[model samples]
Every structure is written in C-alpha cells, then in structure tokens.
Target chain A: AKVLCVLYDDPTSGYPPLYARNAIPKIERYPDGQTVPNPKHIDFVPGELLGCVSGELGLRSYLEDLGHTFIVTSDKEGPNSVFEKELPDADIVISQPFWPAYLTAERIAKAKKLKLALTAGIGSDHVDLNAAIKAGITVAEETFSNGICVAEHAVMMILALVRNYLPSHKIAEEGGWNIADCVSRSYDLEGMHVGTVAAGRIGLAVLRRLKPFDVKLHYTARHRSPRAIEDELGLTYHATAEEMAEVCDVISIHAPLYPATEHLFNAKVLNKMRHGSYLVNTARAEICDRDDIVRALESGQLAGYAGDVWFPQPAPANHPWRNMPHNGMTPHMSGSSLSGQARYAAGTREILECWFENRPIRDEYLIVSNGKLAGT
Target chain B: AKVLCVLYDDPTSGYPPLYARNAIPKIERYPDGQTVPNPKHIDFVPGELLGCVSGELGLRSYLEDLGHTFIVTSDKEGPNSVFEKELPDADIVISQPFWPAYLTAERIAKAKKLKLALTAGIGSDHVDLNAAIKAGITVAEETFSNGICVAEHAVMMILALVRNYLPSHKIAEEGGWNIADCVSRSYDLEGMHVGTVAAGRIGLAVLRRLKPFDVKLHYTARHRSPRAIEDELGLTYHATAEEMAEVCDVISIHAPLYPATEHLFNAKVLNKMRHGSYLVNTARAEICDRDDIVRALESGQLAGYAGDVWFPQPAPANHPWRNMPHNGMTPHMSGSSLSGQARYAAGTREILECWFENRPIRDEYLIVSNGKLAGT
Candidate 1:
C-alpha cells in the first residue's frame, strides 16, 4: 500500500514529523566536541536531517521497512499540486485542518485508488464527505484531539476584541502610550451576555471555559445538551439563533458547516444581533456571509469579528476578511497547535496500526465509513 | 484645601474630569438640527482644553463644589513638569498608576503642604512610601480596584506567548500563511508547570483562572495561602522562587517591588530557571532587571517575556523592552482598562470624601499612614 501525508514545512518551532526524523537514533554534540547517543535533541533542528521535509508523522521508516511506499509533501494547493499528483496511487491520505489538502468531490472522483481519508486534527470540513461516502472511501479524524485548543482560541479571541487588545498593543509597538485611544471602546467581558451557536464538544468546551469570566452563558443548537450539563455550566438555552443574538454581546459560532447551515449568518441574521456586539467563528468561514460581515463592521453594527478559520485555507493575500477593520483574522490554526499535533500524530499512527492489523478503528473517529455516515 | 490631580491626556476616550468640564451644560448637533440636554458628551472633546489634561479621577466637581481648589495636569515628567510646578501648594495629590506623578523623596520634601498622596488605581510603588511616612504624608491606593483586571491581563499575555499569537496575527496582517512558521513555537498551556511569585490577590486570582487549563500550579510567597484554598486550586507551595523556577515552564511575577525584591529576577536567579521558560511580570518592572531580561531573551534562556508594567510610567520611547524579541509588551495599561478605570475613579472619589469630611478612610486602602505601613 502507498501512503501520502500532507503537512507544512517548518524548521522554526520544533514539530517532530515522524517519518523523516524519529526512526533513526539521535546524536548529541558536547562542549568538548564529543558525539554521543543524544535522544534529547532528536526533534531539535540542528539535530534533524538536513534534507528531510516530513517529520514524525511521515511514517516513512515503518512503511518502507514493511515494503510499502510512503510519500510526504507540503505543496497541496491547486489542481496540479503535490497532493493531487500523489493521490491517484495512494491507498491512504492524511491531511490537517490547519493547512488542509482540500479533497473536493471532483478530486475524490479522480483518486482511483484512494481508500481512506484521515484528518490528523479535529474538524473534517475540508473533506467532501458525500463524495467519500459515494466512493466507498473511509473518512475519519482524530476525534477530541484539539477541542480544548480551539475552545481556548475562541476565548482568547473574545477577550481580544472586547478588551481592544490589538490596537492597544499596536500603540505600544509604535512607542505610544495614549490611554484613551486604547480604552475608548474597550470593555470588560464580565456581566455581558455571551452565547455559543452550537453546543457540541468544542462549543460546550468554550462555554465551560468562559464560565469563570462571570459572563451570562447561553447556547442554542438543534439538540440541547443534557439538563444536568446545562445546570452545571449555568447555561441558558435559546431555541433559535435570533433569540440568542438579540441578547448576546458576543456570539461564538461552533456549528459545523453543512448544506442546511451554509451562510447561516447572512445580513438578516446578523442584523438581528445586538448593535456593537462581537462575533467569534472558529468553525468554518462559509458559515458566515463574508460580504455581510464586512458591511456590518463598516456600519458599526458589529463591533468586531475574530476567528482562526477562513473561507479558503491559506487565504490569498487579498482576502477581504484580512483587511476588515476590527478583525482578528489568523491563519486556519486554533487546532493543530504543537501540543495538539502530538496527539493527532499519535492517533494517525494508531489508525495505521489498526488498518495493518485488520482491527476496527474507534467509532467516534469515523466520519464516513462503509459507505455511510458513521459519526454524528 | 488645594488638590492637584495628575492624569494622562486622552481626548479620545471619555474621561470625566469633573472639575474641568462639569460647570458647563452640554449641547448636541444632529443632521436634522436637533438639540437636547447632553451631559454624556462632556469631556469627550473634539478639541480638549489645551492645558487641562485627561482626568477621570480629578473629582473636580465634587471637591470644587465643596469649596476646595482643584488643579489637574497631564504633565508629570521631568524637573519642571506640571506636577512639580503645582506640588509646592497642593495639600492632597491624586495620580494614577498609568501616568504616575512619581513622587520621590525630593518631591515630597518640596511639597510642604502635601498631606495626602492618593493612587487612583492600585500599585502605589511610584510614590516614595518611606519618604511619605517620614514626612507625615499618608499614602493610599484603591485596593482591589483593578486587581482582577491586571490578573486577566496576565492570563492574556501568558497565552499570547505560548500560542505564538503575535507572529501568527502578524502573518494575517501581512497576508501570509506559513503554518510551520506559526506552529513551530506554538504550544499548549495545559500540562505545563506554571507558577506565580506571590500568592496575593492578583497571583491567587491568576491561579484560579488558570485552573481549568490543567497546568501544574506552583507558587512561592512570604506566606502560604490557607490549606483549603491551596487544596481547592491544586496548588503547590514552594519555599523559594528558585525552587519554583527549576520546574515551572512559566513564572509570573505578582509580588510588589521593594528594596528587597528589586532585581529579584537578576541574571543569577534567571539563569537558574528552566531554559526556554516564559516570564510574565505585570507586577513591577524593577522586580526584574531590564538588561538581564533582554539578554535572557536573546540567549534563549527565556522563550518570551510579556507584561504591561514598566520601570517608569510613560516609558521613554527608546525603552529596551519596547523592541525586544518575543515580547508582548503594552503600555502600563493592564489596570487602566475602562471597567477598572470606573472602579478606581469611584474609589478615588470615596477617598476624597473621607479626607474632606475628616473621616477615617478604609484601613485596607492605606499603604502608609502615621509614619508606618498601615496595610498588609
């Protein structure tokens, strides 16, 4: 079996890509110019293989030693991309939400031998689930790998907007100390109405994390969380987004992007939100109407919009959201942090092992398998 | 009695310098030519009074209405600054930690009529307390006024460094998405050993806020917190900072700056810390040697240093910390947030009321009174 893994190339902060570095014995250089078996610096760059592109997740040695082919690349964009070039003959492909190898229906149709699609981190929105299901391809992700990671990012973005952190930090960077300039619109998150659009693992995690800020917590979803969970978190459930938006000073989007939920936050829905309120969306960029968000910000209807997800992964330089005033736009990160990467990378290894041993993967990890949706 | 208030000028953020602006009734102009009683817009100036500065805690209307002379200025720097110019005749002086008047021993000696020195916000270390006590000048700050505000800031800074927030955000601003560049240094705060130097109000609050992150909490203070409190927070108390540093991945300084604590984090102590650990100091800049901190960052002994405190209020434009690598520095602003400003401003009024009525002030708010330390 041939395996293709897509990840970004980084020599800056240490990310141990398994295939390229881990299988070999590490070396250490001492002050007296002595060399020894140094496992301590295996992940460190000077200690890393000079021409290696893939790291720990590459699974190069294990696959090669087993007489299987393994390929890794960071260039996953466009029709003629490295991922597309390798996908045709690969039995398994792994990608990350942070730098996704977007597998659309057309692309899935072209990958004749692709039997499995794996997400190294949480969130499989980048994959065309309908296409995978139709093609009898298995789709799975590292469930719960980085729920806390994304949830923490949501909280950070919420505080970043409410406190007007960016502009104030900007003033400091430029050597200015104008207090009024920084605090004019800055507010405390306390005593504010904060709500999450959905109450899934990531959403519920966000609400739980925000409880200590003393803000009123509210959530609305197709299915309300258990009564005990609600009571424990002091969360009030709104039957609809409109109801929640009317009261919330901050609305965080946590719902998945599906056909029924596409453009869920268009102008009309956003118009219902309280004036001068903030919005945080770490789910999917298409969940919100891009143009409407910009217009709302321009009219001062929305005080700020912050998130780590964007419509196109590795958003083009001219993406409108990038220049939207009061936005706290980041690359599609939040998940895929160094710590989260370790968990998902391990999960990837476990999944590969299960495949090799003909054992069933965890049910929660499956998004679509055996030609059906296996996870809710 | 004459009162002098020193505050930063900010015509942008609405600062209620009551004495300077309250005497006149406000007017409003609408597109359709509408006029109304608009007291809300006072001191929110398009053109602020040339000499009178931004003064939220001026308490001018309250003091002046009671027939006391009130003077306010933003010029608190250098030998001939407005503060020094007015110091000789003022009976009571009010200043904020953000734009402190920096009342030194010489300034206290020059101010023959000075009887009271009040800090509108917390942290009165700017005033020479020993000099104040010896000169029979009572020194007090609004205790607990903005402690939560500062604690929240410490949390934000800690996450900013660990998550590699600055560089990632910079990528968005500059329109780049190199996942490897962003995630290389990005880390999870969970499972890390986090410690605080003092378990006072701010330190303890930080511990409580960080509890959900699953970090191992350690602290070293002059006195350990109550056994129940420590148990509830899962806190470990160390006898010394050196011990805490050896294990902590992040060390936050919350202790006050004193002669004993000055340069407490000098090279010797800093070198003993885990290499590449993070340091957060929203307490006082003098507590950590400035030059040593820069060196540590350069040498990678410290991964990052983030805080809003500085050695001097209105730090000189050329301050070294301003340009340090991996720094998330801001102006002395953690405590002057709008919410915290309102609290401290009200506290300033309460203090003025006590003084004017010859009633005893809250003992907890007193730093030095009757030639001795009056607050613990």
Candidate 2:
C-alpha cells in the first residue's frame, strides 16, 4: 500500500526561498523560541498535486509498511500542472490551502484511477463538486480541527479595534498625554451587542466564548440552532446580516468565502450598520468589498476594522488595507498556530488511516465523500 | 440666594475641545485646525479648593435660600491652599482626583467645623484614613461607580499583549512584511490560563468579560465567590498570589493600592510568575513595583504588560513604564469614558443630594459619612 501527501514548502528555508518561487510561506512559532516553518521545502519532489497528498497523509509510508507501492506528488496548482499530470495514475490525491491542488472537472475526467480527494484541513472548496460526483470520486475535509483557534482570533480583533487602540497607541508614542482625548471616543463592551454571520463550529464557539461578557450575543445563519442552545448561550437569532448589523455594536464574519457570500459586506449592506460600529473579519477577504470597508473607516462611518485574512495570501506591499486607519489587521493568520498545527497534523494522519483500511470513514470528517457532499 | 461657583474659565468657549478641561468648550475649530488659546486662564484662588467643592456641590445656594451665608475658594493643592484654610470653618469638604485636596491629619485636626469627607469618584487612597477616623470625620469613596468601563479595559490589555499586537503593528508601521517574524510571538487565548488578583466588582467584571475567550480563569482574594458562580464561569480559585502566578499564564492586578498591597507584585513576587506569563495592571500602579514590571518586559521574563493607572495621576513624561518595550500602557483613561463619566457624574450628584438634605444616604454610595469609614 502507498500514501500521498501535499504540503506547503518549508518557509524558513532561506535557500530556494518562497520569494523566488512566488509562494507564500505560512509558519508558526512556540514559547521555547522555536519556529517550525512549512515542512515541504525540506523534502520536495515533482508530482501531480494529487501525488503530493499521498506523502502528507503518509499513505505511501503506511501502505508501503503494509507491502504495497504508493505514488504521490508535491506540485498542486496550475492547468498543465504536475498535480493534474499525476492524478490519473495516483489512487489518492491530498492537498491543503497553504499548497492547494485544485481538483477541477477536466482533471477528474483525466484521473480514472483517482478514487478519493482528501483535504487534510477543514476547507475543501478548491475541488469542483459536480464534476467529482460525476466521476465517482470521494472527497472529504477534517471538521473542527482548527476552528476554535480561528474563533478566538476573531474575538480578539473585534475588541482591539472597537477600543480605538491604533490611534490611542499612536498618540501615546508621540509624547501625548491627553487621556480625555483617548477615552472620550472609546467605549465599554459590557452592555453592547455582537453577532457572527455563520453559526457553524467556529461561529458557535465564538458565541459560547462571548456569553460571559454580559453582551447580547447573536448569529444569522442558513439554519438556526436549537431553541435550547440559543437560550443557554443567550443568543438572538437574526434572519439576515442587515438585521444583525442594525443592532450589533460589533459584527464578525465567520462564513465561508464562496460565490454566494462574495462582496456580502458591500456599500448597501454597510449602510445598514450603525454609526461607530466595529467590524472584524477573520473570514476570507474576497467576501468583503475592500474599497467599501476602507471608505467606511475613512469617513468615520465605521469605528474600526481588524482582521488577519487577505484576498491574496501574503498581502502585497501596495495592498490598500495594509495602511488603513483604525485597523488592527495582521497577515494571513488565525488558524495556524503551533499547537493548532500539532492537532491538525495528527488529525491528517488519522484521516489517512480510514482511507487505506477501506474502513467506514468518520461521518464528521467527511466534507465530501463517495461522489457526494457529506457531513458539515 | 447667591452661589459662589468656582468653575474654571472656559478655553475654546464656543465648542468642544480635545482635553477634558477644553472638552465642552463653546467655540468650535480654529483657522488651522487648532484650538485658540484662552484669553482668561482660570487662576487658583487662595483657600479656593473648598470654594470649588462647596460651590459646585450647590451647598451655599441651597443653604443661603434658607438664610445661611457660605464661602468658597478655587486653590486646592498648596501649603496655604484655600481648601486648607476653608476647612477650619467648612461643614463638609469635597475633592476629586482631577483636583485632589489633600486632607492630612494635621489639617483635619485644625478643621473644627469639618463633619464629612467625600470623594467625588472611585479611589480614596489620597485621604488620610486614620486621621479622618480619629477626628470623627466620616471618610467615603464611591465604589463601582465607574468599574465596568475600566474592567473592560483590563480585559482588552490582557488580550492585546497575549496576542503580541504592539510589536506586530510596529512591524506593519515600519513597512515590513515578515509574517512569520511578526506572528512568532503571538498566541491564541484559547487553552491559555488567565486570572485576576482580586474578584471585587471590577475584578469580577474583568473575569466575566474574559470568560468567552475560553482561557482558564482564576482569582485570588480574601473572599471567594460562591462555587456555583465559579463553576458556571469555569473558574479556579487560588488562596494567594504565589499559588496563582505559579500556574496562570497571565495575571491582571485588580487589588486596591494600599499600604498592604503596595509593591505586592515586586521582584520577589514577579519571580514566582511562570516564565512566559503576561501582566495587566489597570487597577492602580502602586499595587506593583513599577521598576519590576519594566525590568520584566525588558528581560523577556514577562511576555507583555498593559493598563493605564500610574502612581500619582497624570504620569510624568519621563515615567519609565511609559516608554518601556512590550507595554500596552496608556494614560489613566480607563474609567473616564463618556459612559463612565455619565455614571460617575450622576453618582456625584447623588452624593451632593444626600449632603444638602442632611438625609441618611444609601450606604453603597457612602465611603465615609457621619465621622466614620463609609463604603469599602
């Protein structure tokens, strides 16, 4: 038996650096001052993006131990890409966001041997859903692996901006002691309202975390939670973002960035927001209308903006949001902590176990399997 | 009836200005976006501190309506301070942190007419506690009048430092794009440990606000909250600071600044803290050794520091903590929010009502009344 693994290149390796290859390096550090960059840079080999998945899932290593041959690849993106070239011959194709090998319709048609498409982490949006189903390819992603980590970061940034911190720190650094100036505009969160756009695993965790703040918590989702869960969390159910935005002092986006959700927070939607409101977006950047958010911040319509996700990961130097005022934005970071990676890495290995054993897969980990959309 | 109001002369008289003194100014903007200087600078009147208090408290106006004469002054902090001279014949003496009127033992002994001492807002550490008791001068300070606003601030600083935001933003300002370098020291609050030293009104509020972050919450105080409340909040209680610091990843100072608590988080106590633990002090600066905090942040023994309360209000420009690295310290502005001010101002008016009517006051509002120590 053989396995396939696809991962981002080791980011810390200065030799054959990511900058030269025009790739973004995502890394995390620990308390011991030890940094663990991406592992791909250390042992990379040419492969169909599908081939890369086998190594990461350790399908090849696990299967080889079981006396079977395994085929994999490290190249994940592009039309005539190695990922596309290798998929037909490979049994399993594994890929991740940090190094995605988009499994589209044409490639699925070419890959007759491709039985499964496994996303090592939570998201599996890169795959062409209808085509995979037509071709009878199973697809799945790990659920709740790093949602809590991302949820906490969302809460952190909301408070950061609402407090008028960037400008306050600016004043502090400039030898100014006008305390009255700093606090007159700042406010207390004790009695205000906050809501999330999605009430999935990450969104619910955010609501649960915020309950103790004595704030009015809310969520606007496709489906509302059980009345008991809502009552326990003291959460109000809003049917639309406009309704939530009208009442919430702070709004955080937690929904997946997709065609239906793109540019959801445009000028018209933003107009519904109350004055002096703060917006924190840990969700993908494309879901937002960049110019509208920047304009709101500049015109004093929005009190502040804070987030870590950018449209193109590793935001370009000229990205407008990089220098936006009243923003607490960071780079593309939120779910990728060292502790988070440890859990995700181990989960990725566990996910491979079911695929190789031909065992019934865990329903929760099955984002898409057996040529159909599965568990959430 | 005549009232001797000792109010400060308005500077930008037509509209609001930037500083508290200029905040409700009458005049609006100047030609160059700067406030024009005041022509009439309010001078400190001799024996005037009491004049300001008695006049503002509306004592003379109400009493004179009943056919009694009253005297007032503006000078509040000097050897020949008007408040000192006026105290000898004054029935009640009032002061605020904005214009503190020191009532030492020697001064209290000379004021034969003095019957009550009232603090305009929270914190009465400026008053001579023993002398007030001995002289039969009731001393009182407003407790929890402006607590929620400040408690929310303590929670903000804790999250700010734990997330390593100050330096990360600094990198952004310096035009750097090293995401790994920027996020290396950052962390998610989820699974982290955080606790407050005292779970009084302000401390409890801080812990409640932090409950949503999913961190382990702990508190140490002479009085522990009920087990049910702690259980609902998922909090652990420690008997002492040593025990708390040994395990807490973050410790926020909420204990009052008193002779017993002053220098409580000194070098010896700080040494007991976990190596990478952070500290937030929005309660009072004197509760912790200022130098020890600065040294800890500098030495990397402490991860980060935050809060605004400094020794003696209006920290001098040369204050070491103001310029220290890894600090999120601000001017003492936490409890001065517009919302907080509204609460304190209304509370201040309530205190004045009790004094004027010679009526029994709500015990919660009284710090000291009828020649006794009032609210804690």
Candidate 3:
C-alpha cells in the first residue's frame, strides 16, 4: 500500500508535523501522469526538508523495510503544489502542527481516496474536524504526548513577565550595568494571584508546579478535579474564567481551540483583566483575537502577553501580534520539544499499530475517530 | 540630639541610585570648602543616584519633627567623605543597598555618640558583624519584609532560562514570526528538576511559590525543617549546594553574601552540574563567581545564567558578564519593588522607633544589636 505524509521533518527543528509526513511513502511525478516502482520504498522523505534533522526515527529506512511506498513533500502550499494534485490515490494522510497541511473542507473533499487522518501530536484543530467526519476519515492525534513540555513553557512565561527579567537582560547584553534601571521595574510573583483555564493535563501540571510559591492558584475546567488534588496543591477552583481573570495576577490559557474558544479573548475580555496582569496562552493563538491582544498590550491594559501557539502554523512574519508590545510569544511550540517529539513519536507508532492491526484505538488516544468527534 | 539621615530624595526614579546623590540637606560647596545652604534646607539630587545613595537617608526632617537637630547627606562614601567626617558628631547612622556607608569598627569607634545603625532593607553583610560587636553599635535591617519579592524573582529567572522566553521575545520584538525559529529552542518545565539553596525566609518563600508547578524542591540550611513541611513540599535536603547541584536541573542561591560565602559557586562546583542545567541567583552577585558562570554558559555546561545582583551595586560598564551569552542577568532588583519598598519602608520606621525608644528591637527584626550580632 502507498501512503502520503505531508508533515515537518525535524522533531528538534521545530517542525514535528514534517517528521510524520516524511515517514509514509515515496511519490514522484512525471510529465505524463506518473510511473515509478518502489525501488527502495524508503519511509523518510529523502533530502533535507529546508528543515534540519539529526539522529533517529529514521523514517526512510524504517518504512522501506516495511515494503510500502512512501511519498513526502515539504512544499504543500501554493500553486506549484504537489499535494493538491497528488492526493487522489493516497490511502492514508499524516500531518502535524510543527508543519501542517491544514486539511480544510475543500482539501478533504478533493482527496477522494483519503480515509485516515492522523495528527502526529496533540491538538488536531489543524484538520477540519467536521469535514473529516463527513469524509468518513478516521481522525486521531497524539493527545497528551506534549503536555508536560508545553506546561513547563507556560510556567517559564509566567515567571518571565512577573519578574521583569526581559528588559534587564537586554540592558546587560547591550553592555550596560544599571541596577536601579533593572530593579525599578522588576517585582516578585509571591502573593500575586495566578490562574489557569481548562485545567487539563497542561493546566493542572502548571498549577501543580506553581503551588509552592504561596501565591493563590485558580483553575477553571469542565470537570473540576477532586478535592484531594486541590487540597494537596492548595489550589482554588473557579467556575468561570471571567472570575479567574478578574482576580489573577497571571492567567494562563490551557483550553482546547474550538468554536467557543475562537475569538474568546477579544478587546472586551482583555480589558477586563487587572492592570499589569500577565496573560499566557500556550493553548492556541486564535483563542484570543490576535489584533485585540496587540491593542491590549499596546494600550497597557495587559502587562504582558506570552504564548507559543499561533493561528496559522509557521505564522507569517507580518502577523501583528508577533511584533506587539509586552509580549513573549514563541512559535507554536507549547507542546512538541525534542523531548516531546520523543514522546509523541512513540505515541504515533502505537496509534499506527492500532490502525494496521484493526484493533480498537485506545479511548485515551482519540480526539476524533470513526468519522465522529471524540474525547476532549 | 543631632541626627543625620542620608537617602536619595528622588529614589523613586527608574535609575534612582545614580542621580540621587547629595539629595538630603542640600549643601553647595565653594572652592574653599565653604558650604552654602538654601533657606529651605531642602536639597534635591538631580537625576538621582544609580550609585549607593551618597547624601543621606531622610532622617533629618524625621528627627527634626521629633524635636531633634538633624543633618543628612547622600554624600557619605568613605572615611574621607563628609558622611564619614560627620559620623563622629551624629547619634544615628542609616544606610541602604542603594548606597551603603560602610560602618566599620574605626568609623563606629570614632562616632562616640552613635547608638543606632539601621539598614533600610535586607542583607547586612556590608557591615562588619564583629566590628559592630566591638563598637557597641546596634544594627538592624528589615527582615522578611521583601522575602516574597526576591523569591518570586528567582522563580521568574528560572522559567526564563528553561523556556528561552527572552530570546524568543526578542525575535518577536525584532519582527519575526518564524514558528520553527522560536519553538526549536523552547521547552516546558513540567517533570524537570528544580531546587533552591538557603530556604530561609526568601528561599522558603521561593519554595512555597514553586510548590504548585510540582518542581522537585530542595533547600539546605543550618538546620533542617520538620518533616511535615518537607514531606508536604516533597523537599530533599542536602548538606551543601554541591550535592544539590548534582541532581538539580536548576539551582537558585539565596544565601547571604559574606566572606565565607564569597565565590560559593565557582568553576569547580559549577563543573559538577549536569549539562543544560540553569543557574539562578537573586541572592548576591558576589555569591557566585561571575566569570565562571559566564564561561559555563558559553561552554554549554550551563544552559542559562540569570541573576539581579552584581558584585558591585552599580556594575562597571565593562563588566565581562555584561555581554555573556545565554544570560538572563538583570541589575540587582529582586526585592526593591514598590510593594517591597513599602514593606521595607515600614520596617525601617519600626526599627528606627526601637532605636529612639531605647527599647530592644524585635528579635526577628535584628541583624545585629546590643553590642553583638543577633537575629533569626
């Protein structure tokens, strides 16, 4: 069987999606349709993917050993697109957030032979879930594989803004040593409130990590955690995010990106925050209206903004929020570090085993499967 | 009794210490050492001090308000300066980190009427404890008033290095949204190891704040805490920092800077650290060898180096660490925020009251008192 993987090439290179895509099959086109035998049947996408890679997860040799044809490409977008015209005969499609082949409804409708869609890592919002469901495509992603990595990043962002280390570091780097300049704007996080939204794996992890500081912790989720965990962590449960935002000195967003979450944080919500409050979103960039965030930061309503996720993967240089004030954004990397890649890579293999063996996918592994939405 | 208070007037400025010199008891000097005083007896140090407040603390008016003669200047530096020259006739000496008048045994011995030496904030190492003991000088600094503030800054620095948020933010501010660019070097803190030394008010405050993130907390002090606090916090105790650094992903220093503790962290000790570990010190810049830290970061033995304190209050423009790589260093500011200022200001007042009333200072408030070093 032949497969097409449109993904990133490097786990360490910030393009995890490419790694999954390059693992599937070899597809080469000719002037007149296409014809080529799987001489090598290499699993890896041959050649450097404008992406850097080192070490193993040797996709090429692994799949070549499987005796299946694997096709790969980094150029998935624009007019010279190979994926657009080449998807007809592909049996399975693989993509990831590190480098996504955003499977819109139109793209899903075009790929007639496509049946399975796998997100190599967590947060499968990159694919059109409804379209995948209508197309009879089984959709799955590495759900909690990268949670710890992103959770840790969130904690880092929280500390950075509160302490005012950014400007201080800059001064030192520029060969200046002014202690008064540094201390004037800096502060401690102790006694200041910290909160999280949708206390899932990442959220709870953050809360658990921050408990020792004696700062109050508040979390809002669909299902509140048991009292034992709360008591152990000394956390407060908030029924709604608005309440948390009103009281928290730092608010981290950990909810999934959904219709309800899209534009969930706009000017109105951003304005509701306490002055000098730090807002972190390792969740997803689109959850807050990007422009509104920029305005909030510019006008000094939000003291700091930090997140690793952006709406479009590999967000364009022109994205306004990327250059906004009081922001600490990194590319869409809340999850998916080299350590995280090692995790999700293992998870991806397990899902592959379930798929090929026709065994029921583990309940915990499904974000959506069998053409229906699945566990949150 | 005549009293002199020496502190900066515009100590509220961003670089308060630099331009705050000679702000108190404004005195203009002529070529012949003739002093001219304005009718108002108010001196405004222009631009303020970034150096140690040289002139005086605001004790003159405060003493005058209490029916005592007052003289104050930020101009106090050494044995030759007016501050040093004036001490023999004064009843009290007030100093601060922003500007410290080293109250050595010689100076204290010369000041026959001097009864009180008050530090405006924490860290009394600048004073000679043994000398104070011999000279019958009572010294007291505000303790724990700014513990939470310093601890919070330590946490912030830890996060900044672990997640690489500063460089990422720099890229954004420089106008770039390369997802792969930022995510490639970023990570989360969950499941990683973190520990702090000292665990005194500031150290314990850091541990308390970090409790929630679930970082493995560690502290080593003169005495071990009861197990309930340790067990509850899941803390591990080490006899020394070397043992702690061996297992820690991050090591924070909160110990006082003293001759015995000078160069506490040097090449030999830092070499024991696991590569990719981060080091944070909000303690004293002199506590660790700055060059060793800079070299470690350059060699990748340390992933990042962050701290607010420098060996000298106002680091010289050409300090080697000023341009060090992978450093999140800021000028000393861990415990000097507005909130912290308010805390220490009140503490200073309380300490002054004790001195004037001839009452023994609060035990917790005393760093050195009653012709001997004392305090918790």
- Global lDDT scores for all candidate models: 0.76, 0.65, 0.66
Q: What is the lDDT of residue B209 in candidate 1?
A: 78
Worst 10 residues of 2 chain B by lDDT: B42-51
Please give, for residues A163-240, the per-residue lDDT of candidate 1 as tens digits.
778888888888887776766556666667899999988898788778766678999998889999899889999998
Rank candidates by DockQ, best first: 1, 3, 2
Winner on DockQ between 2 and 3 is: 3
True contacts kept of each: 0.47, 0.27, 0.45
lDDT by residue (B92-168, candidate 2, tens digit) is 66655544667788777887877766665577767777787777766655556557767777877877776667776
Q: What TM-score does each prediction get for chain A alone?
A: 0.87, 0.79, 0.83
Task: Chain A only: give the TM-score of model 2.
Answer: 0.79
Residue range A1-376, candidate 2, lDDT tens digits:
3234455443342322221111111324322233332222222221112112322433344457667555545566565666666666777777665456777787778877877787766687778888887777788765665676687777777766655566676666566666545654565555568899988778887787677666788889878888988888888899888888888778889998767789988888887877667788887788789999999988766878888777665467777888886788876545654334444554565666666666766676676666667633
Task: Identify the superior model by DockQ, candidate 1 or candidate 3.
Answer: 1
Per-candidate interface DockQ score: 0.33, 0.18, 0.25
What local lDDT score does residue A257 receive in model 1, on the 0 to 100 scale? Answer: 85
Ranking by lDDT: 1, 3, 2
Residue pairs clashing in model 1 are: A13-B184, A16-A56, A17-A55, A17-A56, A17-A57, A18-A55, A18-A56, A18-A57
Q: Write the per-residue lDDT of candidate 3 for residues B49-141, one digit (tens) a residue.
A: 222343233234555677987665667766688788788888777766655677776777788998777777777766777877777767777
DockQ of 1: 0.33
Q: For every model in order, what is the number of clashing pairs? A: 8, 53, 63
**lDDT tens digits by residue: candidate 1, B1-376:** 9988887785453444212111111222211232221222222332122112545453566677779988888888778887898889999998887777888999999999999999878868778877888998889877777777787888888888887788788899898887766666676676778999999888987887788766789999988889998998899999988888888889999998777788999898888887778999999999999999999988878889998888766778888898887888887777776666666666677777777778887787789988888754
Candidate 3 lDDT tens digits, A1-376: 4566765444434443322111111223211232221222223333122222332333545555667566776568863577666777777777667677778988888888887777767777768888877777888766666676777788787777665667767777777655556554455565568888887777877787776655678887768988987887788888877766777778899998777778878887776777667789988788889888888877777878888777666677677777677567776655655455555555566666667668876676666666678853
